[PDB]
Amino acid sequence: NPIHDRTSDYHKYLKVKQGDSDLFKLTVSDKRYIWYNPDPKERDSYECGEIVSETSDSFTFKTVDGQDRQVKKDDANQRNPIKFDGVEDMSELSYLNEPAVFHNLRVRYNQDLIYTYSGLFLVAVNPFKRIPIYTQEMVDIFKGRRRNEVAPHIFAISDVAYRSMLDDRQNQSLLITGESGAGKTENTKKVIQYLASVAGRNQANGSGVLEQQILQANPILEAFGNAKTTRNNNSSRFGKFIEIQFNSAGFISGASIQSYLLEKSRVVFQSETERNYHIFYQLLAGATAEEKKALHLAGPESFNYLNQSGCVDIKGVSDSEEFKITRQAMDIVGFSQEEQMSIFKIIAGILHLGNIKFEKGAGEGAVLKDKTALNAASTVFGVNPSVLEKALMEPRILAGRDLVAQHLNVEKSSSSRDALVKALYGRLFLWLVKKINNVLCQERKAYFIGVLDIYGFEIFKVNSFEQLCINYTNEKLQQFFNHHMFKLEQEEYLKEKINWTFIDFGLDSQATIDLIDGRQPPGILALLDEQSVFPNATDNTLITKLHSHFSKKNAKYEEPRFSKTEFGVTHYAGQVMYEIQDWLEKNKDPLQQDLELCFKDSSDNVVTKLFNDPNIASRAKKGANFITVAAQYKEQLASLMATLETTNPHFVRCIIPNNKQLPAKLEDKVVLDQLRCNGVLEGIRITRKGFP
Numbered sequence: 001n002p003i004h005d006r007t008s009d010y011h012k013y014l015k016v017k018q019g020d021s022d023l024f025k026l027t028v029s030d031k032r033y034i035w036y037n038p039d040p041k042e043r044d045s046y047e048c049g050e051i052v053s054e055t056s057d058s059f060t061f062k063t064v065d066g067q068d069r070q071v072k073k074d075d076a077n078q079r080n081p082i083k084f085d086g087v088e089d090m091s092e093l094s095y096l097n098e099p100a101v102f103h104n105l106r107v108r109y110n111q112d113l114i115y116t117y118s119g120l121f122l123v124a125v126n127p128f129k130r131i132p133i134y135t136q137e138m139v140d141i142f143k144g145r146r147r148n149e150v151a152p153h154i155f156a157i158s159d160v161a162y163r164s165m166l167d168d169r170q171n172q173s174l175l176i177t178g179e180s181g182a183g184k185t186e187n188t189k190k191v192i193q194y195l196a197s198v199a200g201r202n203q204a205n206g207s208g209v210l211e212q213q214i215l216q217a218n219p220i221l222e223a224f225g226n227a228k229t230t231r232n233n234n235s236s237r238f239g240k241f242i243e244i245q246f247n248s249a250g251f252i253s254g255a256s257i258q259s260y261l262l263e264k265s266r267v268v269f270q271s272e273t274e275r276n277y278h279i280f281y282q283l284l285a286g287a288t289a290e291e292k293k294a295l296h297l298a299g300p301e302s303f304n305y306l307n308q309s310g311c312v313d314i315k316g317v318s319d320s321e322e323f324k325i326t327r328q329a330m331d332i333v334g335f336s337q338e339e340q341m342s343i344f345k346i347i348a349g350i351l352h353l354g355n356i357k358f359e360k361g362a363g364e365g366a367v368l369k370d371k372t373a374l375n376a377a378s379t380v381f382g383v384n385p386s387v388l389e390k391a392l393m394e395p396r397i398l399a400g401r402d403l404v405a406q407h408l409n410v411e412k413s414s415s416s417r418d419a420l421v422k423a424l425y426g427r428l429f430l431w432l433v434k435k436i437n438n439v440l441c442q443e444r445k446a447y448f449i450g451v452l453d454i455y456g457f458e459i460f461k462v463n464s465f466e467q468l469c470i471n472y473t474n475e476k477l478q479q480f481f482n483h484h485m486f487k488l489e490q491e492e493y494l495k496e497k498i499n500w501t502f503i504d505f506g507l508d509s510q511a512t513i514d515l516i517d518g519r520q521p522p523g524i525l526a527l528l529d530e531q532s533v534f535p536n537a538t539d540n541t542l543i544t545k546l547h548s549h550f551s552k553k554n555a556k557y558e559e560p561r562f563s564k565t566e567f568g569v570t571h572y573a574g575q576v577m578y579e580i581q582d583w584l585e586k587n588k589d590p591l592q593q594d595l596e597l598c599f600k601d602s603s604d605n606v607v608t609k610l611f612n613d614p615n616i617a618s619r620a621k622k623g624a625n626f627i628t629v630a631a632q633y634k635e636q637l638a639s640l641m642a643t644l645e646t647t648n649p650h651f652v653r654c655i656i657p658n659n660k661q662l663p664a665k666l667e668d669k670v671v672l673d674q675l676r677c678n679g680v681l682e683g684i685r686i687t688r689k690g691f692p
């Protein structure tokens with residue numbers, strides 16, 4: 001048994017190392033210590049001081065240096081007996097305070113122990129390096145073990161959700177929270193791997209193909225949906241809820257993926273030191289000479305959509321090698337050789353479209369002097385270069401019932417070219433998902449375990465509509481944890497009348513949530529929609545209306561004195577300033593019909609489905625207007641949350657160690673802000689003084 005064999009990889013990599021004689025001598029000491037702030041300015045940096053004396057309400061301790069301080073006992077962060085350092089469950093700590101919880105996490109982290117239980121949920125601190133703990137051997141160890149019999153691990157929480165699904169015959173969900181780069185996606189991959197193993201079928205010839213396809217579905221979406229941002233080299237630019245389905249016997253019957261709002265703006269713009277989607281780089285590097293030739297491809301520096309950030313490479317990653325993986329994932333899933341080539345023609349097409357350089361003519365209208373890029377794109381897409389040309393600069397619209405040809409200037413033509421690009425990429429992503437889903441859904445499920453992997457809370461120098469939608473989602477996931485951890489728990493106790501005194505844990509993201517998606521009174525999204533459908537509305541009339549409604553009226557809103565185009569929203573993870581530029585068009589997500597017409601007549605079959613298929617090319621109509629991006633997203637986020645409520649949830653809180661993606665550098669301030677806003681210690685207090 002590996003569990004008990006101290007010489008195993010398990011003990012080696014998942015268990016705390018045996019202390020020595022000198023450590024024992026320290027462990028049996030009678031001295032008592034306290035965690036204090038050497039600087040009262042920096043409350044997150046602590047040192048350990050020894051308590052030398054005590055009055056009825058105070059403690060006098062010594063500081064690392066030559067001095068002595070006194071503190072009220074009710075204001076003291078006592079240090080747990082060292083025997084607790086490295087404990088696998090922090091609900092077991094004598095003293096439960098901030099420095100105490102961080103210290104234990106730090107102790108384990110320094111030994112590459114990234115998993116630690118914090119009551120009923122698991123905490124995960126990003127190692128930022130590889131650790132040999134997700135091997136098939138490790139999987140087999142956790143197979144069927146009770147949470148307290150084995151070490152903290154993502155495999156452990158997975159098996160528990162699994163047994164609960166079988167024992168209670170109820171649906172389960174694994175909610176992995178964390179800001180950008182914290183490790184949500186890696187752990188998500190692990191939960192899938194584990195379930196696929198312990199619950200898959202290992203018959204031969206035809207058998208186990210499903211579980212292999214389930215696994216191969218991730219690398220495809222990652223190539224089209226992930227990209228390098230300043231916070232993560234493999235940031236997920238789309239949200240995801242994966243449904244692992246099981247039959248009545250408890251065997252994987254299949255799975256479906258529900259994607260959420262891809263960043264469609266990234267295809268045409270990346271800020272300095274960021275990349276466009278990985279796929280653009282894997283194609284340009286992994287394509288053969290013929291493909292490269294029949295596609296009119298060149299190097300990254302040759303494409304406007306790939307040479308503006310100044311970054312075409314990611315340290316330690318080979319796009320060429322990555323491309324081989326992607327294509328192999330597509331094969332296994334089932335993408336015909338034809339479909340794939342179409343998929344790359346689109347990628348190549350999008351690249352050429354970004355090369356089209358519009359210029360002014362003799363008048364205000366725009367013209368296209370060089371038609372190389374235009375011709376190239378038209379070729380790979382299989383569309384009439386002249387139809388496409390007029391559809392870009394002179395799209396036709398109705399003026400009443402009259403058909404009027406527009407003559408878009410340079411700026412307008414470029415924006416229209418970008419809208420096409422984004423619609424193009426956006427629909428492709430949805431097609432890929434649809435496709436994969438038809439492969440994985442081959443049997444009526446009896447039960448499922450939902451694994452959520454959203455885009456994490458993020459902040460950049462410039463925050464736009466995209467960031468608001470992302471942080472709004474994180475804000476709701478957090479309230480989901482607060483709701484379940486405290487509100488429902490206590491609402492239960494008090495219902496049974498088990499003699500409980502209500503506790504206010506001070507965790508509530510409702511005010512921030514209402515400010516964003518509030519309807520009555522109208523929140524930010526509601527006002528955005530109003531203005532969005534108001535003809536004479538501008539980004540300036542939108543910000544003015546936003547300030548008007550919330551400035552000095554809502555505690556979570558702020559009208560900055562340093563700017564006229566930004567507004568702040570106080571989230572659980574911090575205040576974020578948002579730039580209002582282009583919000584109206586982003587929410588409208590416009591696309592000229594002449595452009596759609598031009599592509600509905602494409603020779604390529606994939607391209608044609610993206611423009612003739614209702615689910616992909618059609619847009620819901622909220623009456624006289626198309627449903628807005630905000631209204632649809634608010635709507636889809638509401639379904640999810642309603643789906644989660646119908647399951648038994650298990651939380652995994654990923655914690656990022658620092659802001660530099662560096663291993664072995666656990667930064668207190670970075671880590672303590674997360675433990676605080678995530679409500680980790682309150683999560684431990686409810687499990688400790690309550691009735692689980």
Ligand SMILES: Nc1ncnc2c1ncn2[C@@H]1O[C@H](COP(=O)(O)OP(=O)(O)O)[C@@H](O)[C@H]1O
Nearest residue numbers: 126128129130180181182183184185186234456
């Ligand atoms: N458990 C882990 N083991 C090894 N590396 C990890 C782990 N978790 C995270 N990483 C590293 O951190 C990066 C970011 O994690 P990721 O899961 O992609 O963030 P996210 O999904 O939270 O936005 C990974 O690409 C990987 O380098």
Ligand code: VO4
Nearest residue numbers: 180181235236456
């Ligand atoms: O950087 V992550 O967006 O996948 O949270």
Ligand SMILES: [Mg+2]
Nearest residue numbers: 184185235236
């Ligand atoms: Mg991710």
